[PDB]
Symmetry: D2
Subunit: 331 residues, 4 copies
């Protein structure tokens, strides 16, 4: 019904499913799928990069990204709450033999460069070998400052460190900046793009970067099990998504901001609104009862002291207004 | 438009496509996709197993299968020419920290148990820990003797070893046996099922085993990158294929044996002659040219001193007759 | 000839040397070395543990300790500045496939349990599996409060977590506590003991724990490369040191606090003041020159903005007085 | 008493222990130990290599050698019965993420190059990336043909593959060839040297090779836990061993050959004699009883259908004659 748990729940639109059914395909392992190739060349050109690769999930996109950047024994500085450190079951370490070096992100979602600098290991056999700095744009909805993005870029060049950006929700930051994707991707060596969240595809993600870089990524994609066959049927949804579902993300943002106020006037404690995300401190009491009370009207959220509500193309404001009524009535 | 490179090139049928678009989906990460669940239960019920899991590729199906069976430092005995040892870039060792103990398969495609026994490491700190015997049913078209299957199952039990079967083309074996899937699946703790080859799906594989075993498989799938969202659309295909594309596999088999005689009468040296696979001894660089001659006539093959012709539903006898005609030509 | 770089520079004493040469050996791989066995039993009996194992280094002692405790994909919480996370080139992750979850230690050198609890991963497929809490007693000279030790032990049990203590200098802590080793060892499932630092051995460390735990440690030691032969000669040293070099550690402590006052009265900015370690705030490149000034006078230190002076049995108060004299000089 | 189990049991001679007690030492981590350095420069110059490194065991020497040659995902072609594949608990794979590719050695102990060639993986994302070829000279006593050694050398250069030689018993082959060590080490990029077997040191091994190569080896030695402190006391035994215990290995060889005949005339079935090794097929009956019968007179061998007797400096011919009497009497 009304799912406010994540934007990963968005479903294929009629026009999308059709484009998926009319897509010409080929064996992607042999690199013969027209659609996959098409989706990749497009992504690479829109971002100003040389190559791109389609993957099953964003989790594999990041695992492959990390393996491509870091050899056995190297490390990547990242956030304590970042997806490719916290939410990917420790894969970079467990499977990739890469040393992780996490640090608390600043309140704004960036990684203080002064702190990043303190974590850069001296070239001594006691330490892992620092090699990469991984960011996450839209970090829990948070849009990273553009001045920071430029600064992280310069800093890594000065330290001869790669810079990767987990862009599961990069177009959300993009619509928010009001600029072209290229303007922000010029500040990284590689980044991912998820198609199965706000952009609304059934499955799919992209890793983009330098030609040689992507070349190595291919070997890892195969090893990890991401080398599909006629995956052009999926890449097709991605293309339709990047050409029709980007601008409208501003609608999710406006709704999140609308809901935030409604909830305010409803009595709910609104902690933070950012892009398609809002946070309500519901408390330990009313928490569980909240999930149950909402689940009854077919309203699905992740019960918790602090609830994270996420808006997407499959949730209108009218539906939000209704959810609001139910929240105001929960009191 | 005639592809004999592999059965992985098969494209969706009209029927399949409509079944895919007409399918209900949901976030599989939450287990909310009814189609993924139905595919998994149908597979499980069909082979007499408790549980099944959907994966992007057979490569990830095996890596996950091996990870779920072998702990860090444990070992698996497998064939020098088996897919999960030779054709998966050594993932089990590279990513999973599992020692591989490969041995040559006999001519019938099985692993001589006397050799397997000689490879079981004593419980001594010099050795890895033999944990699993992995087999591959349909091995390069070869169908393992049902007698051996039983022997291997009994052998492992007696030696407290787990048994896994890579069934990328197990249905080709089933059809060749003339029995039910469960009659052969009974001799393995876990087995894999590829839907993207002969069954004609665009993507996907299944790993089938005990409930606890499969539960571990789920964590590994996630870490490896295969935890997709709306896999329903993809699962839908697998459904249609398992109910409508198994039996016809007989047609591919007949075509392979039909073509063997065509190429024989032509002048080619047909070496082997199994299910949907055909092996011809072309000889050096009279083959790298064959790939040219055939490519020119819109006939796609995998040029090599020993060519491997693979049949499937996207190749007909009429087209096969054309290849035999074109083949005999340059001779 | 005055080394304050570390207590790892200590050289064998006359007494120690004769004990080494006068020792009976045998192939430890077969457990045939009476001296290795006696060292291992003495350590075990002394700390109230079932078993102990001899290792080449403390680095291998920890890597093995972590491997024996954590399976592939499991995780350990540790301090951002702990040896087995920061000073061992990330081995636990790189070689053992264990996810590291580091956190900043409080000023007293402990890991705030509230922070540790916040890091325990829920049993969800996105997360690694929190298995162990690793501590480091004597942390850079700091002696952890006995109260905390008990707290950590209780905390872990309640949360079903294992507890390991890196005791490279645990005897420095013991002497500082004024209690018996077993009175602090009781609050950990496993702990390590370095014999090559303050105790004055040329090489070696011990890992102490349960019999089953240590049994696993033995396989890992072998694979890691520490299964030596006639380790008896080396074990002999450890024996002598544990019975003749523990108590004197008080002398190093007094010298450190004596020197703190010497350098204070001189003009240096003594920052910290713990067991056999001393920290001075030198300031940038007025330090890279200090290393020159001192090196010139046969005084070996580890030049740095924040110098770390370490005392041991191969440095006397007389020599310390000389350094204080030479230090005040260039000021 | 009379140990014929292995040559690893040899004990330090009086002159050796003394050289160990008089050796000047330093912290090897800082690279200040005079003796270690001395032992390394000597080994490197005698073999015609640029650098050398001392390690705790030969097992770590090989693990480090493999990690230094192969990055995550690469492979090494080696023997099914080779030490760094079979007797090192699968470390190259388990800890190093290196794919192992074993093949049966020819009867003479070499690895047929024609078979090595068939195992070299094409540069395709399906395969691990072949990088190294590892040999073992003196393989179970067997001295590898010199023409073969030269051939393997050329072959690897033609295929751009590294060539490593596990020389745990290299000086045994050397004394047997009648040439200088350099003449055989010129045919490899790197090799190990064990000091704790025929050469008779308590502990110790060496990895030798190119400067850059050894440099990387150091990082791995630290990670694995082989970076010791005042290990000059051990390296000292090595030096005394390479300058006094090499020539006399011809005495072990002569004795092995003497024993082989005695046992012949005694009634024992002598299968093979090679350097300091002899093999007797004792059978499944008389096997266990043999170990017990011998263990009674203080004669230690490894009971088995086929017994491997190893001679060393701690076993005279007179002792062998006595062992022979006991074997002849066992009938
Ligand atoms: C996925 N979204 C989680 C959520 O519900 O907020 C995600 C990914 C990878 O997605 P997956 O399909 O592999 O699970 C990568 N990075 C971030 C920051 C998120 O948020
Ligand atoms: C050791 N010798 C075993 C025997 O008893 O024959 C060995 C080594 C490594 O020695 P370790 O001290 O690490 O165990 C490496 N390579 C070979 C061929 C042997 O044989
Ligand atoms: C094709 C194949 C695989 C891998 O399948 P993907 O889905 O392409 O990764 C594994 N095993 C066998 C025996 C195969 O034929
Ligand atoms: C010195 C030290 C180690 C490592 O010791 P090695 O024997 O040199 O590897 C580990 N932990 C601490 C806390 C140390 O001070
Ligand atoms: Ca979606
Ligand atoms: Ca297909
Ligand atoms: Ca590994
Ligand atoms: Ca010392
Ligand atoms: Ca690893
Ligand atoms: Ca010895």
């Amino acid at each position: 019904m009304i799912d406010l748990r994540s934007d990963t729940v968005t479903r294929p639109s009629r026009a999308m499913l059709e484009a998926m059914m009319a897509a010409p395909v080929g064996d992607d392992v042999y690199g013969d799928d027209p659609t996959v190739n098409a989706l990749q060349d497009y992504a690479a050109e829109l971002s100003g990069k040389e190559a791109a690769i389609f993957l099953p999930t964003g989790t594999q996109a990041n695992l492959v990204a990390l393996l491509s950047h870091c050899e056995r024994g190297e490390e990547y500085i990242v956030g304590q709450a970042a997806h490719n450190y916290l939410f990917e079951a420790g894969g970079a370490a467990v499977l990739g033999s890469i040393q992780p070096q996490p640090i608390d992100a600043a309140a704004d979602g960036t990684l203080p460069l002064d702190k990043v600098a303190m974590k850069i290991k001296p070239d001594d056999i006691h330490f892992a070998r620092t090699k990469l700095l991984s960011l996450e744009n839209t970090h829990n909805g948070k849009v990273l400052p553009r001045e920071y993005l430029k600064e992280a870029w310069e800093f890594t060049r000065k330290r001869n460190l790669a810079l990767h950006v987990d862009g599961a929700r990069i177009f959300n930051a993009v619509v928010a900046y009001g600029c072209e994707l290229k303007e922000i991707t010029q500040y990284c060596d590689s980044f991912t793009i998820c198609l199965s969240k706000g952009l609304g595809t059934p499955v799919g993600s992209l890793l983009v970067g330098n030609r040689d870089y992507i070349k190595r990524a291919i070997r890892w994609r195969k090893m990890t099990g991401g080398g599909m066959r006629q995956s052009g049927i999926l890449a097709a949804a991605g293309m339709y998504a990047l050409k029709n579902n980007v601008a409208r993300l501003q609608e999710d943002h406006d709704n999140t901001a609308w809901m935030a106020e409604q909830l305010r006037e409803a009595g709910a404690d609104v902690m933070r609104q950012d892009t398609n995300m809002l946070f309500v401190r519901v408390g330990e009491e009313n928490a569980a009862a909240l999930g149950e009370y909402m689940k009854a009207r077919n309203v699905l959220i992740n019960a918790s002291p602090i609830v994270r509500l996420v808006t997407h193309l499959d949730v209108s404001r009218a539906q939000l207004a209704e959810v609001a009524a139910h929240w105001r009535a929960f009191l």
